């Protein structure tokens, strides 16, 4: 009973949230200016992507991007590529991603049609995990899609399978400061597309752990939590949240704000990250 939904960025591009496996999200990027399609985090259960393109939609389907190596994110790369181009498979250089033809590292960009895809290194959950920051260079104010895989979820973070709290702090610092160059004007139009529907458990955590009961961020967390749960209730994805929203509701991301670190009073940022991870 899990539905797709589609997030649109002005007239420039769209991102379709495709529920896969039990709780995974794969994504379809659609560049409207050139009719070019790309998939993110294709696993064994890739047919829902085709059914969407199929039912809902002259198209070039040119790229697959993998946030990290884990099978529930890359297990469909080869099988999806086989049909039938050429299909470029993008993945972080240090994750040895199945079927990769474009290994990438921090600062690299690839084009999907006229869209730019910028790569951010985020080792922790895997040694080679990356994030993909997608936008239209000629339409920067229409917003940004950020694909976070298993590094960041709504109100949450992934397990540190191949790394540690220092690695996650660095990842949170990068995400937090993406838009420093524009005085965070684009935070409100930057949308977060994570690996899984884990929003429920993490929002319950944010609501319980938020330290300042006098702030309206508590009321905000509460309203957001209910909002996401009602979506999940109708089959709708909880995702995406905006980066502006995450900066309020995601306590792990807020480790990148020194005032929040001081308010939590659980040691320095590294200590606090470990405190939150262990709670
Ligand atoms: Zn993973
Ligand atoms: Zn995963």
XYZ file of N, CA and C and ligand atoms in Angstrom:
839
model
N 0.826 -1.248 0.000
C 0.000 0.000 0.000
C 0.847 1.280 0.000
N 2.127 1.176 -0.335
C 3.007 2.354 -0.359
C 2.918 3.100 -1.691
N 2.558 4.375 -1.641
C 2.310 5.167 -2.849
C 3.577 5.867 -3.323
N 3.647 6.211 -4.610
C 4.701 7.165 -4.981
C 4.226 8.601 -4.715
N 5.160 9.547 -4.682
C 4.769 10.974 -4.813
C 5.839 11.699 -5.619
N 5.509 12.879 -6.142
C 6.422 13.631 -7.003
C 6.627 15.050 -6.502
N 7.888 15.407 -6.272
C 8.284 16.763 -5.854
C 8.774 17.530 -7.080
N 8.169 18.689 -7.361
C 8.602 19.495 -8.520
C 9.384 20.769 -8.164
N 10.403 21.050 -8.966
C 11.259 22.198 -8.733
C 11.041 23.245 -9.830
N 10.111 24.171 -9.601
C 9.655 25.126 -10.630
C 9.194 24.393 -11.887
N 9.601 24.859 -13.054
C 9.343 24.070 -14.270
C 10.581 23.250 -14.703
N 11.640 23.295 -13.894
C 12.955 22.782 -14.302
C 13.093 21.262 -14.217
N 12.743 20.711 -13.057
C 12.817 19.275 -12.872
C 11.880 18.771 -11.791
N 11.725 17.441 -11.739
C 10.908 16.769 -10.730
C 11.681 15.604 -10.145
N 11.350 15.243 -8.914
C 11.915 13.997 -8.284
C 10.740 13.137 -7.799
N 10.648 11.920 -8.345
C 9.594 10.984 -7.958
C 10.114 10.014 -6.913
N 9.378 9.946 -5.804
C 9.733 9.072 -4.680
C 9.111 7.693 -4.957
N 9.952 6.681 -5.173
C 9.464 5.332 -5.530
C 9.723 4.380 -4.353
N 8.664 3.968 -3.646
C 8.784 2.981 -2.574
C 9.266 1.632 -3.109
N 10.376 1.131 -2.578
C 10.893 -0.183 -3.017
C 11.194 -1.101 -1.807
N 11.309 -2.414 -2.045
C 11.523 -3.403 -0.962
C 10.493 -3.239 0.183
N 10.918 -3.261 1.461
C 9.991 -3.118 2.577
C 9.839 -1.656 2.984
N 10.972 -0.971 3.089
C 10.965 0.422 3.509
C 11.981 1.304 2.775
N 12.496 0.837 1.642
C 13.481 1.627 0.882
C 12.772 2.673 0.039
N 13.496 3.732 -0.293
C 13.101 4.634 -1.364
C 14.159 4.570 -2.440
N 13.705 4.360 -3.670
C 14.494 4.692 -4.854
C 13.870 5.968 -5.424
N 14.586 6.632 -6.326
C 14.066 7.877 -6.921
C 14.247 7.975 -8.418
N 13.297 8.661 -9.039
C 13.438 9.029 -10.419
C 13.530 10.542 -10.590
N 14.658 10.982 -11.121
C 14.847 12.379 -11.462
C 14.367 12.597 -12.896
N 13.544 13.617 -13.107
C 13.089 13.959 -14.448
C 13.457 15.414 -14.802
N 14.431 15.595 -15.689
C 14.788 16.920 -16.213
C 13.792 17.304 -17.317
N 12.878 18.231 -17.004
C 11.844 18.637 -17.963
C 12.375 19.413 -19.167
N 13.565 19.989 -19.045
C 14.077 20.849 -20.109
C 14.594 20.016 -21.283
N 15.015 18.777 -21.013
C 15.574 17.887 -22.043
C 14.907 16.495 -22.098
N 13.920 16.277 -21.235
C 13.289 14.966 -21.043
C 14.278 13.819 -20.749
N 15.224 14.074 -19.844
C 16.230 13.088 -19.458
C 15.864 12.555 -18.087
N 15.963 11.233 -17.921
C 15.629 10.582 -16.658
C 16.864 9.935 -16.043
N 16.927 9.948 -14.712
C 17.950 9.247 -13.949
C 17.290 8.587 -12.721
N 17.782 7.423 -12.334
C 17.323 6.741 -11.131
C 18.356 6.844 -10.022
N 17.901 6.935 -8.779
C 18.789 6.896 -7.614
C 18.483 5.661 -6.759
N 19.538 4.961 -6.339
C 19.432 3.816 -5.399
C 18.494 2.709 -5.853
N 18.853 2.142 -7.002
C 18.132 1.048 -7.619
C 18.547 -0.277 -6.969
N 17.578 -0.956 -6.389
C 17.838 -2.282 -5.789
C 17.188 -3.400 -6.614
N 17.102 -4.614 -6.043
C 16.498 -5.762 -6.725
C 15.043 -5.506 -7.136
N 14.336 -4.718 -6.334
C 12.933 -4.407 -6.553
C 12.866 -3.121 -7.410
N 13.314 -3.186 -8.658
C 13.383 -1.978 -9.481
C 12.169 -1.761 -10.394
N 11.338 -2.778 -10.541
C 10.226 -2.662 -11.466
C 9.252 -1.528 -11.151
N 9.021 -1.195 -9.856
C 8.172 -0.018 -9.571
C 8.604 1.276 -10.272
N 9.908 1.430 -10.511
C 10.437 2.565 -11.285
C 9.846 2.518 -12.696
N 9.928 1.349 -13.329
C 9.384 1.181 -14.690
C 7.876 1.354 -14.753
N 7.161 0.826 -13.749
C 5.688 0.942 -13.709
C 5.303 2.438 -13.666
N 6.039 3.223 -12.874
C 5.798 4.672 -12.820
C 5.952 5.338 -14.195
N 6.966 4.909 -14.943
C 7.281 5.504 -16.251
C 6.564 5.131 -17.583
N 6.200 3.887 -17.918
C 4.833 3.248 -17.822
C 3.580 4.087 -17.572
N 2.991 3.979 -16.383
C 1.686 4.580 -16.090
C 1.648 6.100 -16.190
N 2.553 6.778 -15.488
C 2.456 8.232 -15.349
C 3.064 9.013 -16.518
N 4.171 8.529 -17.066
C 4.751 9.164 -18.239
C 4.478 8.272 -19.463
N 8.654 10.831 -25.320
C 10.021 10.779 -25.834
C 11.132 11.053 -24.776
N 11.658 9.987 -24.174
C 12.565 10.127 -23.024
C 13.885 9.382 -23.179
N 14.965 10.027 -22.753
C 16.236 9.357 -22.563
C 16.382 9.015 -21.036
N 16.644 7.753 -20.712
C 16.841 7.332 -19.328
C 18.333 7.008 -19.248
N 19.154 8.012 -18.926
C 20.608 7.908 -19.163
C 21.518 7.500 -17.986
N 21.052 7.676 -16.747
C 21.930 7.579 -15.577
C 21.281 6.832 -14.421
N 22.099 6.040 -13.743
C 21.756 5.514 -12.433
C 22.801 6.041 -11.457
N 22.358 6.568 -10.303
C 23.329 6.957 -9.249
C 23.112 6.197 -7.966
N 24.204 5.718 -7.368
C 24.135 4.913 -6.139
C 24.778 5.688 -5.020
N 24.022 5.902 -3.944
C 24.585 6.655 -2.808
C 25.664 5.856 -2.094
N 25.487 4.533 -2.057
C 26.491 3.631 -1.440
C 26.320 2.179 -1.886
N 27.257 1.317 -1.469
C 27.369 -0.022 -2.046
C 26.312 -1.047 -1.601
N 25.614 -0.778 -0.491
C 24.802 -1.790 0.150
C 23.766 -2.304 -0.832
N 23.480 -3.605 -0.743
C 22.659 -4.278 -1.776
C 21.277 -3.671 -1.977
N 20.661 -3.195 -0.891
C 19.344 -2.549 -0.990
C 19.413 -1.167 -1.642
N 20.605 -0.752 -2.067
C 20.772 0.518 -2.784
C 21.417 0.327 -4.162
N 22.045 -0.816 -4.402
C 22.791 -1.012 -5.632
C 22.445 -2.324 -6.346
N 21.633 -3.161 -5.698
C 21.342 -4.514 -6.218
C 20.572 -4.602 -7.514
N 20.199 -3.461 -8.064
C 19.481 -3.451 -9.333
C 20.195 -2.724 -10.436
N 21.364 -2.164 -10.125
C 22.174 -1.432 -11.117
C 22.404 -2.173 -12.425
N 23.003 -3.358 -12.330
C 23.277 -4.200 -13.491
C 22.011 -4.628 -14.235
N 20.994 -5.102 -13.507
C 19.762 -5.572 -14.128
C 19.003 -4.423 -14.786
N 18.862 -3.288 -14.100
C 18.210 -2.108 -14.699
C 18.989 -1.576 -15.912
N 20.318 -1.462 -15.792
C 21.156 -1.043 -16.927
C 20.992 -1.946 -18.144
N 21.003 -3.264 -17.932
C 20.848 -4.241 -19.025
C 19.679 -3.889 -19.934
N 18.653 -3.247 -19.399
C 17.501 -2.868 -20.217
C 17.562 -1.397 -20.717
N 17.804 -1.145 -22.010
C 18.359 -2.107 -22.971
C 19.839 -1.775 -23.185
N 20.502 5.185 -24.841
C 21.657 4.864 -23.975
C 22.897 5.515 -24.619
N 24.122 5.298 -24.083
C 24.619 4.419 -23.010
C 24.247 4.869 -21.594
N 24.011 3.882 -20.734
C 23.648 4.142 -19.349
C 24.888 4.296 -18.477
N 24.998 5.472 -17.881
C 26.091 5.779 -17.014
C 25.672 5.391 -15.594
N 26.525 4.627 -14.921
C 26.296 4.282 -13.522
C 27.301 5.037 -12.640
N 26.787 5.886 -11.758
C 27.618 6.758 -10.921
C 27.637 6.180 -9.474
N 28.804 6.201 -8.837
C 28.918 5.717 -7.459
C 30.206 6.251 -6.870
N 30.281 6.329 -5.542
C 31.486 6.852 -4.880
C 32.667 5.933 -5.190
N 33.792 6.535 -5.572
C 34.997 5.815 -5.969
C 35.397 4.753 -4.927
N 35.273 5.061 -3.651
C 35.793 4.171 -2.605
C 34.801 3.110 -2.076
N 33.621 3.033 -2.671
C 32.659 1.988 -2.317
C 32.619 0.816 -3.286
N 33.367 0.893 -4.403
C 33.397 -0.208 -5.400
C 31.969 -0.648 -5.739
N 31.158 0.307 -6.169
C 29.737 0.045 -6.414
C 29.518 -0.862 -7.623
N 28.679 -1.910 -7.460
C 28.336 -2.768 -8.568
C 27.920 -1.985 -9.829
N 28.596 -2.313 -10.937
C 28.306 -1.815 -12.300
C 28.692 -0.341 -12.562
N 29.350 0.308 -11.587
C 29.819 1.716 -11.757
C 30.665 1.938 -13.033
N 30.328 3.001 -13.760
C 31.134 3.430 -14.910
C 31.695 4.831 -14.682
N 31.144 5.542 -13.696
C 31.601 6.882 -13.317
C 31.909 6.940 -11.804
N 33.126 6.505 -11.380
C 33.432 6.658 -9.945
C 33.568 8.140 -9.641
N 33.059 8.570 -8.476
C 33.080 9.992 -8.110
C 33.636 10.264 -6.710
N 34.154 11.483 -6.555
C 34.712 11.935 -5.285
C 34.275 13.372 -5.063
N 34.498 13.863 -3.852
C 34.013 15.167 -3.438
C 34.322 16.221 -4.496
N 33.323 17.017 -4.865
C 33.534 18.127 -5.817
C 33.266 17.770 -7.273
N 33.201 16.473 -7.581
C 32.902 16.034 -8.946
C 31.487 16.449 -9.282
N 31.236 16.770 -10.559
C 29.865 16.924 -11.030
C 29.620 16.040 -12.269
N 28.386 15.588 -12.428
C 27.965 14.902 -13.655
C 26.687 15.603 -14.069
N 26.382 15.549 -15.366
C 25.147 16.105 -15.899
C 24.094 15.038 -16.076
N 22.869 15.369 -15.678
C 21.692 14.605 -16.066
C 20.837 15.547 -16.934
N 20.945 15.398 -18.246
C 20.368 16.385 -19.138
C 21.082 17.712 -18.928
N 20.311 18.755 -18.626
C 20.867 20.071 -18.268
C 21.039 20.258 -16.769
N 20.617 19.260 -15.978
C 20.779 19.312 -14.512
C 22.208 19.015 -14.068
N 22.668 19.726 -13.050
C 23.947 19.387 -12.471
C 23.767 18.479 -11.245
N 24.633 17.481 -11.149
C 24.680 16.609 -9.971
C 26.050 16.771 -9.315
N 26.074 17.408 -8.165
C 27.306 17.627 -7.410
C 27.444 16.551 -6.337
N 28.676 16.118 -6.112
C 28.975 14.973 -5.243
C 29.579 15.463 -3.964
N 29.065 14.956 -2.836
C 29.607 15.326 -1.515
C 30.074 14.029 -0.866
N 31.346 13.972 -0.439
C 31.834 12.772 0.259
C 31.238 12.720 1.651
N 30.673 11.565 2.019
C 30.151 11.385 3.383
C 30.473 10.017 3.963
N 31.766 9.672 4.079
C 32.077 8.334 4.618
C 31.569 8.262 6.054
N 30.928 7.146 6.392
C 30.590 6.767 7.769
C 29.829 5.450 7.679
N 28.588 5.527 7.191
C 27.750 4.355 7.057
C 28.463 3.319 6.149
N 29.024 3.801 5.034
C 30.069 3.013 4.328
C 31.226 3.949 4.123
N 32.428 3.376 3.946
C 33.666 4.127 3.704
C 33.581 4.991 2.445
N 32.698 4.621 1.512
C 32.587 5.325 0.234
C 31.257 6.016 -0.058
N 30.395 6.134 0.927
C 29.072 6.799 0.778
C 29.273 8.248 0.297
N 28.430 8.650 -0.647
C 28.359 10.012 -1.088
C 26.914 10.520 -0.961
N 26.757 11.835 -1.101
C 25.437 12.464 -1.251
C 25.399 13.105 -2.611
N 24.219 13.171 -3.228
C 24.091 13.818 -4.545
C 23.217 15.059 -4.408
N 23.791 16.201 -4.802
C 23.122 17.498 -4.717
C 22.735 17.894 -6.140
N 21.435 17.895 -6.428
C 20.947 18.061 -7.809
C 20.225 19.381 -7.988
N 20.591 20.119 -9.028
C 19.871 21.329 -9.383
C 20.040 21.712 -10.859
N 19.302 22.720 -11.278
C 19.457 23.290 -12.621
C 20.296 24.571 -12.536
N 21.525 24.542 -13.088
C 22.451 25.692 -13.124
C 21.813 26.976 -13.660
N 20.880 26.827 -14.597
C 20.203 27.978 -15.182
C 18.923 28.353 -14.431
N 18.619 27.621 -13.355
C 17.414 27.874 -12.543
C 17.678 27.605 -11.051
N 18.778 28.176 -10.512
C 19.252 27.818 -9.186
C 18.162 28.036 -8.131
N 17.357 29.099 -8.280
C 16.315 29.421 -7.299
C 15.097 28.479 -7.298
N 14.983 27.575 -8.281
C 13.910 26.561 -8.265
C 14.187 25.467 -7.234
N 15.411 25.436 -6.723
C 15.736 24.555 -5.606
C 16.725 23.459 -5.926
N 16.893 22.572 -4.935
C 17.932 21.584 -4.917
C 17.350 20.281 -4.370
N 17.635 19.164 -5.019
C 17.316 17.851 -4.463
C 18.599 17.293 -3.862
N 18.562 16.949 -2.582
C 19.701 16.307 -1.947
C 19.380 14.856 -1.607
N 20.097 13.937 -2.265
C 19.945 12.509 -2.026
C 20.974 12.046 -0.997
N 20.474 11.589 0.151
C 21.325 11.353 1.342
C 21.550 9.871 1.667
N 20.882 8.974 0.939
C 21.075 7.520 1.144
C 20.877 7.172 2.609
N 21.835 6.421 3.175
C 21.713 6.019 4.569
C 22.596 6.887 5.464
N 22.964 8.121 5.035
C 23.736 8.989 5.913
C 22.800 9.802 6.806
N 21.772 10.368 6.175
C 20.801 11.189 6.901
C 19.405 10.745 6.497
N 18.507 10.676 7.477
C 17.094 10.406 7.227
C 16.340 11.621 7.734
N 15.016 11.649 7.581
C 14.296 12.706 8.255
C 14.436 12.521 9.764
N 14.994 13.542 10.429
C 15.286 13.525 11.859
C 16.299 12.459 12.305
N 17.056 11.873 11.368
C 17.879 10.765 11.731
C 19.174 10.638 10.968
N 19.934 9.609 11.349
C 21.214 9.266 10.698
C 21.323 7.759 10.557
N 22.203 7.326 9.672
C 22.425 5.886 9.532
C 23.409 5.344 10.556
N 23.389 4.018 10.720
C 24.376 3.338 11.558
C 25.795 3.476 10.987
N 26.776 3.536 11.886
C 28.141 3.860 11.488
C 28.894 2.567 11.154
N 28.391 1.800 10.193
C 28.971 0.472 9.916
C 30.462 0.511 9.607
N 30.880 1.547 8.887
C 32.272 1.586 8.441
C 32.946 2.897 8.852
N 32.628 3.401 10.036
C 33.129 4.724 10.415
C 32.745 5.026 11.849
N 32.737 6.307 12.221
C 32.530 6.664 13.622
C 31.859 8.029 13.747
N 31.733 8.511 14.991
C 30.941 9.736 15.247
C 31.623 10.941 14.629
N 32.962 10.887 14.523
C 33.706 11.985 13.898
C 33.298 12.115 12.462
N 33.201 10.960 11.766
C 32.751 10.915 10.376
C 31.330 11.478 10.226
N 30.394 11.085 11.102
C 29.033 11.606 11.038
C 28.975 13.106 11.350
N 29.795 13.603 12.268
C 29.818 15.050 12.547
C 30.234 15.823 11.324
N 31.281 15.341 10.648
C 31.746 15.938 9.400
C 30.669 15.951 8.311
N 29.932 14.843 8.183
C 28.824 14.768 7.250
C 27.724 15.770 7.561
N 27.391 15.902 8.842
C 26.371 16.857 9.289
C 26.816 18.295 9.074
N 28.093 18.588 9.344
C 28.677 19.886 9.034
C 28.563 20.269 7.538
N 28.897 19.319 6.650
C 28.762 19.551 5.212
C 27.312 19.849 4.819
N 26.359 19.021 5.280
C 24.945 19.207 4.927
C 24.467 20.555 5.479
N 24.818 20.835 6.731
C 24.378 22.080 7.384
C 24.791 23.326 6.580
N 26.005 23.300 6.027
C 26.606 24.490 5.411
C 26.554 24.533 3.883
N 25.788 23.616 3.309
C 25.647 23.574 1.848
C 25.443 24.970 1.254
N 24.549 25.744 1.881
C 24.126 27.038 1.328
C 24.718 28.244 2.057
N 25.840 28.024 2.737
C 26.524 29.145 3.383
C 26.796 30.292 2.392
N 27.142 29.931 1.154
C 27.501 30.891 0.107
C 26.364 31.805 -0.321
N 25.127 31.399 -0.023
C 23.948 32.218 -0.317
C 23.192 32.641 0.958
N 23.934 32.709 2.057
C 23.344 33.047 3.352
C 22.096 32.201 3.650
N 22.152 30.913 3.259
C 21.123 29.896 3.521
C 19.747 30.233 2.937
N 19.716 31.146 1.978
C 18.465 31.456 1.252
C 17.836 30.220 0.588
N 18.667 29.321 0.090
C 18.142 28.129 -0.585
C 17.787 26.976 0.336
N 18.068 27.098 1.643
C 17.662 26.002 2.578
C 16.162 25.614 2.449
N 15.302 26.634 2.390
C 13.833 26.411 2.243
C 13.374 25.731 0.947
N 14.231 25.742 -0.078
C 13.941 25.004 -1.322
C 14.898 23.840 -1.629
N 15.567 23.331 -0.604
C 16.460 22.192 -0.743
C 15.706 21.068 -0.058
N 15.452 19.993 -0.799
C 14.613 18.905 -0.298
C 15.448 17.635 -0.145
N 15.182 16.914 0.948
C 16.007 15.802 1.416
C 15.330 14.485 1.016
N 16.040 13.657 0.245
C 15.535 12.385 -0.290
C 16.433 11.247 0.259
N 16.035 10.659 1.381
C 16.872 9.677 2.077
C 16.586 8.225 1.632
N 17.312 7.300 2.216
C 17.273 5.904 1.785
C 16.049 5.125 2.176
N 15.426 5.502 3.303
C 14.363 4.679 3.899
C 13.269 5.500 4.565
N 12.108 4.855 4.727
C 11.014 5.381 5.535
C 11.290 5.072 7.015
N 12.248 5.785 7.629
C 12.550 5.632 9.066
C 12.072 6.862 9.897
N 11.299 7.717 9.252
C 10.894 8.996 9.798
C 10.176 8.842 11.143
N 9.228 7.909 11.213
C 8.471 7.675 12.453
C 9.344 7.559 13.721
N 10.272 6.607 13.716
C 11.094 6.315 14.895
C 11.994 7.488 15.250
N 12.534 8.144 14.229
C 13.394 9.295 14.477
C 12.651 10.520 14.984
N 11.421 10.766 14.526
C 10.666 11.927 14.998
C 10.214 11.716 16.440
N 9.917 10.462 16.774
C 9.595 10.098 18.140
C 10.797 10.403 19.030
N 11.985 10.029 18.551
C 13.236 10.387 19.219
C 13.429 11.910 19.371
N 13.238 12.693 18.287
C 13.386 14.177 18.369
C 12.424 14.794 19.389
N 11.171 14.355 19.352
C 10.153 14.862 20.282
C 10.515 14.563 21.745
N 11.055 13.376 22.017
C 11.438 12.973 23.365
C 12.714 13.681 23.810
N 13.658 13.939 22.955
C 14.996 14.356 23.351
C 15.231 15.855 23.257
N 14.393 16.557 22.519
C 14.601 18.005 22.385
C 14.664 18.665 23.794
N 15.776 19.350 24.086
C 16.113 19.781 25.440
C 15.367 21.018 25.946
N 14.815 21.824 25.044
C 14.283 23.135 25.432
C 12.774 23.185 25.266
N 12.072 22.923 26.357
C 10.631 22.837 26.294
C 9.968 24.214 26.140
N 10.731 25.298 26.357
C 10.195 26.673 26.164
C 10.196 27.120 24.690
N 11.044 26.500 23.864
C 11.084 26.806 22.417
C 9.911 26.229 21.627
N 9.453 26.969 20.611
C 8.442 26.466 19.674
C 8.924 25.398 18.678
N 10.232 25.153 18.645
C 10.747 23.991 17.914
C 10.143 22.663 18.427
N 9.841 22.587 19.731
C 9.123 21.439 20.274
C 7.739 21.279 19.609
N 6.922 22.327 19.681
C 5.633 22.351 18.993
C 5.784 21.992 17.501
N 6.832 22.497 16.862
C 7.092 22.211 15.455
C 7.361 20.708 15.231
N 8.304 20.145 15.993
C 8.596 18.698 15.968
C 7.280 17.869 16.127
N 6.428 18.290 17.060
C 5.195 17.574 17.352
C 4.241 17.590 16.152
N 4.065 18.762 15.543
C 3.195 18.958 14.372
C 3.730 18.183 13.140
N 5.042 18.256 12.938
C 5.721 17.537 11.876
C 5.598 16.027 12.053
N 5.740 15.565 13.292
C 5.650 14.141 13.582
C 4.276 13.620 13.193
N 3.245 14.369 13.563
C 1.878 13.957 13.285
C 1.654 13.994 11.778
N 2.266 14.982 11.121
C 2.083 15.179 9.689
C 2.641 13.988 8.933
N 3.862 13.594 9.273
C 4.493 12.459 8.640
C 3.738 11.137 8.880
N 3.275 10.930 10.116
C 2.523 9.728 10.461
C 1.218 9.624 9.704
N 0.573 10.756 9.423
C -0.681 10.712 8.676
C -0.422 10.396 7.211
N 0.713 10.856 6.697
C 1.137 10.499 5.347
C 1.361 9.004 5.257
N 2.141 8.463 6.209
C 2.476 7.033 6.220
C 1.179 6.227 6.338
N 0.258 6.749 7.135
C -1.070 6.141 7.275
C -1.854 6.002 5.960
N -1.743 6.973 5.049
C -2.480 6.876 3.764
C -1.690 6.172 2.650
N -0.485 5.718 3.000
C 0.415 5.080 2.053
C 1.435 6.045 1.484
N 1.355 7.320 1.865
C 2.181 8.348 1.236
C 3.557 8.356 1.903
N 4.606 8.644 1.124
C 5.922 8.784 1.750
C 5.969 9.956 2.761
N 6.717 9.818 3.856
C 6.983 10.960 4.726
C 7.883 12.002 4.009
N 8.633 11.552 3.015
C 9.671 12.373 2.389
C 9.115 13.128 1.153
N 9.732 14.279 0.766
C 10.916 14.927 1.390
C 10.573 15.969 2.447
N 11.489 16.247 3.393
C 11.452 17.452 4.239
C 12.391 18.430 3.557
N 12.337 19.709 3.925
C 13.305 20.663 3.392
C 14.518 20.749 4.346
N 15.631 21.289 3.882
C 16.783 21.450 4.777
C 16.492 22.450 5.925
N 15.711 23.479 5.611
C 15.222 24.412 6.635
C 14.476 23.651 7.752
N 13.590 22.734 7.366
C 12.915 21.905 8.352
C 13.861 20.995 9.147
N 14.776 20.343 8.449
C 15.711 19.417 9.118
C 16.553 20.125 10.177
N 16.891 21.382 9.895
C 17.695 22.186 10.809
C 16.925 22.466 12.094
N 15.611 22.230 12.089
C 14.824 22.362 13.328
C 14.619 20.999 13.965
N 14.241 20.004 13.158
C 13.761 18.720 13.709
C 14.827 17.611 13.829
N 15.988 17.782 13.201
C 16.993 16.727 13.135
C 18.112 17.042 14.123
N 18.060 16.384 15.282
C 18.975 16.737 16.370
C 20.415 16.409 15.988
N 20.571 15.394 15.135
C 21.902 14.920 14.693
C 22.501 15.996 13.772
N 21.699 16.484 12.843
C 22.151 17.604 11.974
C 22.502 18.833 12.819
N 21.698 19.085 13.875
C 21.910 20.270 14.718
C 23.200 20.214 15.527
N 23.870 19.053 15.547
C 25.250 19.013 16.135
C 26.179 20.004 15.405
N 25.841 20.365 14.159
C 26.661 21.313 13.407
C 26.418 22.791 13.776
N 25.479 23.018 14.680
C 25.244 24.343 15.269
C 25.849 24.420 16.674
N 26.931 25.202 16.852
C 27.598 25.299 18.149
C 26.686 25.743 19.305
N 25.626 26.505 19.019
C 24.708 26.923 20.080
C 23.874 25.742 20.552
N 23.517 24.872 19.623
C 22.764 23.680 19.976
C 23.655 22.719 20.793
N 24.910 22.540 20.364
C 25.868 21.744 21.163
C 25.963 22.258 22.593
N 26.096 23.582 22.746
C 26.168 24.172 24.068
C 24.865 23.974 24.845
N 23.719 24.119 24.188
C 22.414 23.908 24.853
C 22.170 22.450 25.360
N 22.560 21.464 24.558
C 22.435 20.058 24.936
C 23.282 19.750 26.176
N 24.451 20.391 26.271
C 25.331 20.254 27.454
C 25.731 18.792 27.708
N 26.094 18.093 26.640
C 26.465 16.696 26.721
C 27.885 16.541 26.198
N 28.714 17.558 26.422
C 30.102 17.537 25.958
C 30.257 18.322 24.664
N 31.403 18.166 24.007
C 31.591 18.806 22.703
C 30.806 18.082 21.595
N 30.851 18.579 20.355
C 30.053 17.988 19.249
C 30.243 16.466 19.116
N 31.489 15.999 19.233
C 31.753 14.561 19.125
C 31.057 13.803 20.262
N 31.189 14.310 21.494
C 30.535 13.688 22.643
C 29.028 13.688 22.441
N 28.487 14.796 21.915
C 27.057 14.915 21.768
C 26.546 13.967 20.699
N 27.292 13.858 19.605
C 26.898 12.933 18.542
C 26.789 11.515 19.136
N 27.767 11.129 19.952
C 27.786 9.790 20.549
C 26.653 9.606 21.550
N 26.403 10.631 22.362
C 25.239 10.658 23.217
C 23.924 10.421 22.436
N 23.747 11.132 21.325
C 22.496 10.989 20.564
C 22.398 9.623 19.876
N 23.533 9.161 19.347
C 23.621 7.884 18.648
C 23.272 6.766 19.611
N 23.779 6.865 20.829
C 23.567 5.818 21.805
C 22.180 5.888 22.454
N 21.515 7.047 22.352
C 20.169 7.207 22.926
C 19.106 6.749 21.923
Zn 23.208 1.136 3.837
Zn 19.660 1.254 3.343
